[PDB]
Amino acid sequence: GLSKPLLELMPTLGTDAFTFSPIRESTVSRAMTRRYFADLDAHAETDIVIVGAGSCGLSAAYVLSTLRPDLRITIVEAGVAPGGGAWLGGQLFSAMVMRKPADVFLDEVGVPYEDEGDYVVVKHAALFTSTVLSKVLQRPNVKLFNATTVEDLITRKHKVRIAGVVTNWTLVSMHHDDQSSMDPNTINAPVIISTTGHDGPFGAFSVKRLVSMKQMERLNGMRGLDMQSAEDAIVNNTREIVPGLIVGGMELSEIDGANRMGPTFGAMALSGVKAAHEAIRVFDLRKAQND
Amino acid sequence: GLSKPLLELMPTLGTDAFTFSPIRESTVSRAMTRRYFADLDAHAETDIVIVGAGSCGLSAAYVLSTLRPDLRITIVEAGVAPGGGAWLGGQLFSAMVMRKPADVFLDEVGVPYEDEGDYVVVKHAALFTSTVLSKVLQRPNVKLFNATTVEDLITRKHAKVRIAGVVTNWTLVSMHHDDQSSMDPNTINAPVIISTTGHDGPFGAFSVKRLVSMKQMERLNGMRGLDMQSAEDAIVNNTREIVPGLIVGGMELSEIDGANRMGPTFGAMALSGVKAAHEAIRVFDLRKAQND
Amino acid sequence: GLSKPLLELMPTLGTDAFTFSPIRESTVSRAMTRRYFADLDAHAETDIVIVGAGSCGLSAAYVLSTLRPDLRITIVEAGVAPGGGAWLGGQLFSAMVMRKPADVFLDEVGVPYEDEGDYVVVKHAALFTSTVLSKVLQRPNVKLFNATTVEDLITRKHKVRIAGVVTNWTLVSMHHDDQSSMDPNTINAPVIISTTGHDGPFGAFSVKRLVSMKQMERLNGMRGLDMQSAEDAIVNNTREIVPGLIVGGMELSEIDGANRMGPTFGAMALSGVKAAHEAIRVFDLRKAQND
Amino acid sequence: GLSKPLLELMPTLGTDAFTFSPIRESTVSRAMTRRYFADLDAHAETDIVIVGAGSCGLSAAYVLSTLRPDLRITIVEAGVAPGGGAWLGGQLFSAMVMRKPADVFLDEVGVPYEDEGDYVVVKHAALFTSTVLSKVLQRPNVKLFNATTVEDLITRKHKVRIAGVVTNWTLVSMHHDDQSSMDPNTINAPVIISTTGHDGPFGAFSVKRLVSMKQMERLNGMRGLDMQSAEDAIVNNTREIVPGLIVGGMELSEIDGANRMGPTFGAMALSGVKAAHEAIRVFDLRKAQND
Amino acid sequence: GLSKPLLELMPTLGTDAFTFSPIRESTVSRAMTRRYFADLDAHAETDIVIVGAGSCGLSAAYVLSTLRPDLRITIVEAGVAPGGGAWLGGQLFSAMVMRKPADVFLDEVGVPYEDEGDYVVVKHAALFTSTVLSKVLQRPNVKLFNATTVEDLITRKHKVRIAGVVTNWTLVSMHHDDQSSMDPNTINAPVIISTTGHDGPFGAFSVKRLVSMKQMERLNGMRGLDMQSAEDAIVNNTREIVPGLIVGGMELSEIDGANRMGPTFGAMALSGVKAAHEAIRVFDLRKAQND
Amino acid sequence: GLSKPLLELMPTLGTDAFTFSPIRESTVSRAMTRRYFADLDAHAETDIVIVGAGSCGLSAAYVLSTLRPDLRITIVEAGVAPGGGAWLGGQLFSAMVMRKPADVFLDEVGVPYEDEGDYVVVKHAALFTSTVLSKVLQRPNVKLFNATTVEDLITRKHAKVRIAGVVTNWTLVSMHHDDQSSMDPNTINAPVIISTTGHDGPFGAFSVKRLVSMKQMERLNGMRGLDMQSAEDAIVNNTREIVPGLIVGGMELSEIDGANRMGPTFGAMALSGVKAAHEAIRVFDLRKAQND
Amino acid sequence: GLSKPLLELMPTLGTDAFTFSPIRESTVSRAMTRRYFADLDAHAETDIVIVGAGSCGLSAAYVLSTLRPDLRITIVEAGVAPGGGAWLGGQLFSAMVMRKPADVFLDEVGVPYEDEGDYVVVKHAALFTSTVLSKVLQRPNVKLFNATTVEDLITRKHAKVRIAGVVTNWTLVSMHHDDQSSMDPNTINAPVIISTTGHDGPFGAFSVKRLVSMKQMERLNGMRGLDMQSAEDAIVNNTREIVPGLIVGGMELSEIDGANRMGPTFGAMALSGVKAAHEAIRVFDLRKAQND
Ligand SMILES: [Fe+2]
Ligand SMILES: [Fe+2]
Ligand SMILES: [Fe+2]
Ligand SMILES: [Fe+2]
Ligand SMILES: [Fe+2]
Ligand SMILES: [Fe+2]
Ligand SMILES: [Fe+2]
């Protein structure tokens, strides 16, 4: 049941006996700003940046921060609420289906499921996302800059190497026409993991920018749905696309022209894992090239 | 560190040695549709409904499902992503400030914080919401119907009315009752309905605004100015059954009561939800008897 | 005249003597969800999927389900209301004009008309569409999923073969930016009939998808209006375009680069009959390939 | 099975042997215009106008044209497709629930159903709608002006009497700003049956217009959902609200402050039957005054 | 001064002595539809069609109807108000400037002006347009179908020959999404004069359509503003682009890749004069081929 | 047949022989700006202002300028193309129906028609509008400020007020008073304003609605149902000075008066403008005196 | 301290002892139109035109009018408010960072800063823009046509072309060539045109995008990733006459050269402006001749 303290408080609610401690509005403001600037300052030069906090990005943020408490992890998520397209299953339904061996990841992060043999099923996709999300955030080396969009990549010569991200408020990135000029800010980082999902108004950002930066010819383009070949491809091909830039999740399907998997998350999760692994493998090198 | 099983799997990713088990698409479909219908069939008739998965509603769901595992709790949230305004702090910033004694609740749900004196600060608003959400979604007596909007209330006579459930529909359908032909809603019968849809706005403050148009209220006193000290006490202390079968809490309450807003501080949303759950339990049997 | 039971009921309406049997909301909600998820389950794996419930789609569904009571036909229509663009004639006018021998089909589905010589005229385009819709829906093996949009195609290797469709609620398909990620659902099928009208926000989906999937050179494009050359072209060329994918109706004009016919439905109707014949010709084989 | 004629034509589809009879585009334009304007001419002055071709209106239309084949019935429907909100059940599902004795009506029009006791269930709302639609449109005295909106009512003194409708193309009604002035057209009629659903951008037209013309104190507005009291109310209180104006269906709930029922069409059917009945009762009187 | 009849009526206004003759709404309705049907029926098959009632098209309509009373001239104008960009000069100002010898045309149509030497200035652009428009509309052989758009062209083999235009209500052409399918209407003609202004949403229709029909490599595109080199170009090159299709006005600039003149209308007027000539030159031959 | 000069020019078109006289863009620019700003200067202070170049406003302007060549007439029309809803008949059809004795006016403005006994029919609404528009613009004492919107009224005391001019701006600016930073309007002082802006709507019934928001009117009775027979009479017969310096006519009148609507018929609009012009003249001297 | 005249006036405010001098609306209207025409008439044919009043354009305008009081400078700014993206720093913040020697330019226009070694910081970007802006507008040979958009260019031959002016229109009109009937643009003839319209977007990078649509450029390399060190030197040292009559600078140049972007750092903009003004002088006599 409930904790004794909370049980002792409840009877108090709705009576003169209950009242919150005194507060001045400036206190709250400063409590927030002082802390946000701290983060903003400390992450202007970070170790690893993760663009897009969906099922894949979060799964990467988890593995990475657990194996490397020594590294600073800056997650830049466009929406106010993180989680990408993992709050639902298919056609607005709830059940999250993960084909084995993705269950190995569900165990790791402590997310229950029904075993069906070749695949497992999480009660609600929300349960998976909220749980993983909750744990990632507990990590002292992780910072979630939600409500923030990546408008461009910080580049360098040698062919180019990605060395950071150009950020701004998601709402600003969306109205660069509905106001006067609003310049973005930056984040210097040796390694960037992009998991912004597939092509769309917001998705497939890093992969599409490489093309506009005339570094890529074109995008093969996410192909039709074929669960069996899709998940396999996304997970095994998750890697450093260009120096300093690692791609995973469905964004990868855009650059590689892989099939899509529809309402099944095994690949996203393990692709998250693969990406964290890649970041580690490539880190020391890019770190040297960035300093 | 990571678990052995995962540490052993990692080296496999990126090699021909890795492959997911076989799967036929329709197995995925049926896997979801089967379970979803079950929910839809089971919750068509439920015990308690909570409208609005914002910080207040979630806190209510937590306390309620914990205290009454015997009760079926149906959470209906408009957005795909649940959490309301609990994903951020103030002005798009992160820090979640909670005035004491709300820290008692934080301890209850296991959410770390920095003791600052009269108030405490949670590293990130997101840290609180995901934790509570995670714990709530783990109770076997709770179901989250996200991307689902409450378009109306199910009423009963005693011209006074009793709220006996909600009229539902896919949020996307609610937002486009013009861009298409007629799309009727669905229903959920329930003895007690908790409404925590936040304050007035395109989507928010549904129940309260509906009571007015159903001609059960003279109008809404409307949310007033920001005064944290008087706002949080007012909200928490007055969470209650506003009309038979309907309890209001959170910022939706400020609209009918005409209370001040508190802005970027979540103590009241948490304890108001605690009180919302307490009220539900106090009233359940009575409404449950009246409803059947 | 009316039936006696109804004539007997009428005097009742408007009096205390009239009342509906008792009911509980949960009863109705269950009557619906139970039956829907039942279809949803039974059609996850189907025999023939018809994309687009317009004059062509409908015509094909009619002939098909009539000739093969054994096959399960899944009609996936985008709009809430079916009927495509066959509710009107031209420029918001009613009269539906069909050139012979399209009248043989109008005789099949029992739709009255005026014989003007080389063509026949249906009183209102709505008379055809409603009658046909009514008859197709009465078939025990036909299921209509209206408000459901086809977002992609389920593919398989060998060049590719179409093995089904990727589905979602039309209102979701239209707002993949007005919310967080919302994954689609799916339906497996050996043969898919696509009749989604010519290019536009909604139309010519299959053929456009074949291009964006990098399976087609480009769309020849729907050409000018020339009824005589157009109708013969749509009808005589309706066929399996790729293993498992049959295209007819005006969508066909997008890939074949045929002329348009404006306000005349003979071709749409007979293209439907042709599409039906094609599904049958090609069925057993694609079926074997898909199991 | 199919008809021999159609079975004999099918093999021909897809061969040089097949070809549509000669045609010239101007023949198709004239075929439609000549007819559409014949209707415009005959209906400019009609016997009964029914606004909104939804389940309630379509039902009323069915009974009115069958009982009085002598009267000209003019149906004005805003949408391109008629049927209102009777193409689906609730939350986009298909099953149409009808509480008894509404099954007597389903018997009348020939729409099959499963008997569940107090209520019967029609396979798919569309089957009911398309079926009834087909029959109404078959009547020689009925005319469906779809894609046409009622923007106002024609009035006369003695308080006022409703004597017709002000019409226009729906698209014009929706864009009285996106262009220069576009005047409406007219249809004189002694009795007007308004069945345009509950309030919304399109709905509850005549009921709201009475208010704006300062004839009504206001709209009590549709109340909460309560199937048992809503349907009994809507059906029993369908009547002539003002001389010349008979309101039924869900539009009546706005002026009466009646509860809503949701995904159940029992009332819409019988309110329609009763609206038609009231039409007949009041016809001679209004016709005498209108002339 | 006013006319005696009017002067005698005036004092009557605002007194009980003034009243309009008896009317019934249906009378007015029938007065319009009957004449519109007549027009819609007589023009389904016409001699010459002019797309776009702007300064250029209108000039062409004038000259063409005046030199050939025997021919039927069908003007299809998208906007509700005809005139295109000739209701104003540049930057919302009023003065209409025409370089000589354009003044020769102004003399012809009876439009006063100030001579400045190389150019003449018309008091207000509206003056020119209202006068030409008034004279064009007076001709017994001219019909103005405004509020109507040309969505496509009618084609014939032999490369293709333009034999008419696909029409629809402008509002319907702008919302082929915001509703169900709405088929267009047709008009057969041996020669079509397109003067739909330069590129944009509505503009440069026929030229752009020649590309989408794979008849043109691309549009050279309207170039920079060089009044002196542009107007001569527009005028001297106005001619039959494809058999049956004459392009003039600024639309011509799109296909020829010519400079623009901005706020000066000599070219437009003389281009129209030229257009009418081409139609006459080419008429008998096209007429022959089209029948 | 065509003129000889034109007939001699046609053969030239299409040959290297045809060419336009020399020109410098700036010459054209100055040709326009000079004249326009001349208009702005002269009309800033005018005699009579007509807001709304519709069938009623145009008829009023025609009668006014013809009976009073001495007065300066300033027409302010929101649309780029003037003519309001006088380009079409009903439901996008052409024919323009005018009941008698409006035909007396059609003879005045030189517009042909088919006599049907109790009413006459003009070939195309457009014929009427373009013809009248043409004869109005020709008068030397009239200026047409198209693409210009009247956003407010200029007032003076005798609390009762007197309308003494219009507040103006480019229509495009009137519709985007958010889509940019602040954009102040301009002004036109005038002792008499004839407002003929049609019935309520985004653009319509400007003055009548403004009188209300200026708290000089209780509320608009609002345009009523359609009844041609009683509507036209009421519109023509009650056209007049509603308030000192403000004459209202056409369909804007039905909004304040609460009169029926006539739909696809124009007799009343035409004779209303005629009455509007008669009233301006009756009232002019008095208002002018007060205004100076 | 304030001025004595103002100090003596204040006590008057809020008493019957205060009142403005008499006025008649028409007077204010004529005071504005009269002057606007003067400008419109004098600039139709001008010396140097600067498209885009952003930081770069503004800087160019300053340097140019200060070195050539004899030249008439016509600035066309699409927005109501000038200044471009120079009202803020990055992510909506204030501080304007300029890397040296860009500080030389701030000393010239009198804008304070904190020296930080290799760079300096102007309190708020608004200080730089407002100061520069103020100083530029004071110049008697400068004219700011704000709320005005360059829809196209004036071209001449020597298929090589020369730029000889700009096709103009009210910005709001430029944005609605579909929301009305045809609205022709006006013109401005000039020998040299400095285009500084920021980088690609609905309004940005105009001349550059136009050179391509006019079929004078193979394509646009497109602005590349953010790399401040290579970006700023590149934009500044490559600012030049791209085509006879057209000088390009600021961030627009990045579109045509495929140079890196610099983000929230304005050093390059200011010195790119100085460079553009300089190029215009170097090129002026020659183009002036070619234009007459
Ligand atoms: Fe930028
Ligand atoms: Fe509804
Ligand atoms: Fe997706
Ligand atoms: Fe109107
Ligand atoms: Fe079409
Ligand atoms: Fe203002
Ligand atoms: Fe233009």
CB G66 within 8 A of CB G108: no
DSSP state of A54: S
Give the closest of G183, G187, G214 to E88, CB-based. Answer: G183
* CA–CA distance, D187 with F232 (Å, rounded to integer): 18
What is the pairing mode between strands F240-243 and G48-51? unpaired
The DSSP secondary structure of C236-249, one letter per residue, reads HT-EEEETTEEE-T
Sign of the torsion angle spanned by Cα atoms F167, F169, F175, F178:
negative
* CA–CA distance, D51 with D205 (Å, rounded to integer): 9
Q: Is C60 exposed, middle or buried (0-12, 13-18, 19+ CB in 10 A)?
A: buried
Smallest Cα distance from D223 to chain B, Å: 5
Residues 6+ apart with CB under 8 A from B251: B56, B198, B199, B204, B205, B223, B235, B261, B269
Tokens of E33: 């539809």
Percent helix / strand / coil, chain G, rounded to 5:
40, 25, 35
Helix (H, G, I), strand (E, B) or coil at G47: coil
Tokens of A211: 């093309």
* Helical residues (DSSP H) of chain D, grouped into ranges: 4-9, 25-43, 55-67, 103-109, 125-138, 170-173, 205-212, 227-236, 252-256, 266-290
Contact D80 C88 (CB under 8 A): yes
In CATH terms, are D14-44 and D45-291 the same topology? no
What is the pairing mode between strands B73-77 and A245-247? unpaired
| Residue A172 CB-half CA count within 13 A | 22
Q: Which helix (H) or strand (E) holds C169?
A: strand C160-169
- Residue (of G185, G188, G277) closest to G239 by Cα position: G277
- F168 C-alpha to ligand 6 centroid (Å): 11
Give the closest of B25, B32, B183 to C164, CB-based. Answer: B25
User: In chain G, whose CA is at the least distance from the CA of F39?
Assistant: G33
Give the closest of C26, C80, C187 to B181, CB-based. Answer: C80
D118 CB within 8 Å of a chain F CB: no
Smallest Cα distance from B245 to chain D, Å: 13
Smallest Cα distance from A185 to chain G, Å: 5
Smallest Cα distance from E115 to chain D, Å: 34
Tokens of G202: 């609905």
* CA–CA distance, G276 with G14 (Å, rounded to integer): 51
Which chains reach chain E with 3 or more Cβ–Cβ distances below 8 angstroms?
Answer: C, D, F, G
Contact E10 F87 (CB under 8 A): no
Chosen for mutation from E80, E225, E228, E255 (greatest number of chain G CBs closer than 10 Å) is E225
Tokens of F109: 């403005």
What is the pairing mode between strands B142-146 and G186-189? unpaired
Helix (H, G, I), strand (E, B) or coil at G7: helix
Q: Is B70 exposed, middle or buried (0-12, 13-18, 19+ CB in 10 A)?
A: exposed
Instruction: Starting from the CA of residue F180, give the closest ligand.
Output: 6
* CA–CA distance, E160 with A58 (Å, rounded to integer): 58
CATH architecture assignment, domain G45-292: 3-Layer(bba) Sandwich (3.50)
HEC string for B177-235: CCCCCCCECEEEECCEEEECCCCCCCCCCHHHHHHHHCCCCCCCCCCCCECHHHHHHHH
State residue D143 phi and psi, 5-degree precision. -140, 125
Question: Which whole-number Å values give the CA distances from F219 to B264, D36, D216, F51, F208, in the listed order?
Answer: 42, 43, 17, 21, 9
Tokens of C20: 């509906």
The DSSP secondary structure of E6-69, one letter per residue, reads HHHHGGGTTSTT--PPP--HHHHHHHHHHHHHHHHHHSSB-SEEEE--BHHHHHHHHHHHHH-T
- Give me the CATH topology for the region C14-44: 6.10.250
* CA–CA distance, D134 with D112 (Å, rounded to integer): 15
- G180 C-alpha to ligand 7 centroid (Å): 12
CB atoms within 10 A of CB E228: 18
Helix (H, G, I), strand (E, B) or coil at C96: strand
Cα B90 from chain centroid (whole Å): 21
Contact F176 G180 (CB under 8 A): no
CB C66 within 8 A of CB C281: no
Q: CA D180, D183, D184: angle at the middle one, nearest 5?
A: 140
B37 CB within 8 Å of a chain A CB: no
E24 CB within 8 Å of a chain D CB: yes
Residues in chain E with CB shorter than 8 Å from the CB of G210 are 224
CB C141 within 8 A of CB C71: yes
Smallest Cα distance from B114 to chain C, Å: 32
Question: Which whole-number Å values give the CA distances from E36 to B21, F86, F89, G38, in the listed order?
Answer: 69, 16, 10, 52
B183 CB within 8 Å of a chain A CB: no
* CA–CA distance, G193 with G163 (Å, rounded to integer): 7
The domain segmentation of chain C, as residue ranges, is 14-44, 45-291
Contact E54 G153 (CB under 8 A): no
Instruction: Starting from the CA of residue G226, give the closest ligand.
Output: 1
Q: Is B46 exposed, middle or buried (0-12, 13-18, 19+ CB in 10 A)?
A: buried
Chosen for mutation from C225, C229, C232, C251 (greatest number of chain E CBs closer than 10 Å) is C225
- Residue (of G65, G50, G144) closest to G108 by Cα position: G65
User: In chain F, whose CA is at the least distance from the CA of D209?
Assistant: F225
Sign of the torsion angle spanned by Cα atoms A198, A204, A210, A212:
positive
Q: Which helix (H) or strand (E) holds C37?
A: helix C25-42
- Residue (of E135, E140, E134, E138) closest to E42 by Cα position: E140
* CA–CA distance, G52 with G207 (Å, rounded to integer): 11
Residues 6+ apart with CB under 8 A from B158: none
Residues in chain G with CB shorter than 8 Å from the CB of F83 are none
Helix (H, G, I), strand (E, B) or coil at B36: helix
Residues in chain E with CB shorter than 8 Å from the CB of D29 are 40, 44, 185-187
Smallest Cα distance from C173 to chain A, Å: 10
Instruction: Starting from the CA of residue D196, give the closest ligand.
Output: 2
User: In chain G, whose CA is at the least distance from the CA of A161?
Assistant: G225
State residue E146 phi and psi, 5-degree precision. -85, 175
Residues in chain F with CB shorter than 8 Å from the CB of E97 are 28, 31-32
- E92 C-alpha to ligand 6 centroid (Å): 21
What is the pairing mode between strands C114-115 and C142-146? unpaired
HEC string for D104-118: HHHHHHCCCCEECCC
The DSSP secondary structure of E153-218, one letter per residue, reads EEEEE--EEEEEEEEEEHHHHT-SSSSS--B-EEEE-SEEEE---SSSSSSSHHHHHHHHTTSSS-
What method did the depositors use to determine the structure?
A: X-ray
| Residue G110 CB-half CA count within 13 A | 8
* CA–CA distance, D275 with D249 (Å, rounded to integer): 9
Q: Where is chain B broken, named by the residue before each break, C–N > 2.5 Å?
A: 158
Contact E1 F278 (CB under 8 A): no
Which residue is associated with the tokens 């009243």?
Answer: E19
Contact B155 D84 (CB under 8 A): no
Instruction: Starting from the CA of residue G167, give the closest ligand.
Output: 7
Contact E273 F13 (CB under 8 A): yes
- Residue (of E145, B172, C1, A135) closest to F95 by Cα position: E145
Chosen for mutation from A30, A58, A122, A134 (greatest number of chain B CBs closer than 10 Å) is A134
Contact B6 A227 (CB under 8 A): no
D124 CB within 8 Å of a chain B CB: no
Contact F91 D213 (CB under 8 A): no
Resolution of the model in angstroms = 2.7
Q: CA A286, A289, B1: angle at the middle one, nearest 5?
A: 30
Farthest CA pair distance, chain E: 70
Contact G185 E223 (CB under 8 A): no
Question: Which whole-number Å values give the CA distances from D55 to B271, C190, D133, G181, in the listed order?
Answer: 48, 37, 9, 42
User: In chain G, whose CA is at the least distance from the CA of A153?
Assistant: G225
Which residue is associated with the tokens 């104190």?
Answer: D217
Question: Which whole-number Å values give the CA distances from D23 to C86, C111, D27, E42, G144, in the listed order?
Answer: 20, 21, 7, 18, 64
Which chains reach chain G with 3 or more Cβ–Cβ distances below 8 angstroms?
Answer: A, E, F
E133 CB within 8 Å of a chain C CB: no
Which chains reach chain A with 3 or more Cβ–Cβ distances below 8 angstroms?
Answer: B, C, G
Chosen for mutation from F130, F149, F274 (greatest number of chain E CBs closer than 10 Å) is F130
* CA–CA distance, G191 with E235 (Å, rounded to integer): 28
DSSP state of A269: H
Chains B and F touch (3+ CB pairs under 8 A): no
- Give me the CATH topology for the region D45-291: FAD/NAD(P)-binding domain (3.50.50)
A92 CB within 8 Å of a chain B CB: yes
* CA–CA distance, C155 with C161 (Å, rounded to integer): 6
Residues in chain B with CB shorter than 8 Å from the CB of A264 are 23, 28
The DSSP secondary structure of F184-195, one letter per residue, reads --EEEE-SEEEE
What is the pairing mode between strands F161-170 and F186-189? antiparallel
* CA–CA distance, F202 with F253 (Å, rounded to integer): 16
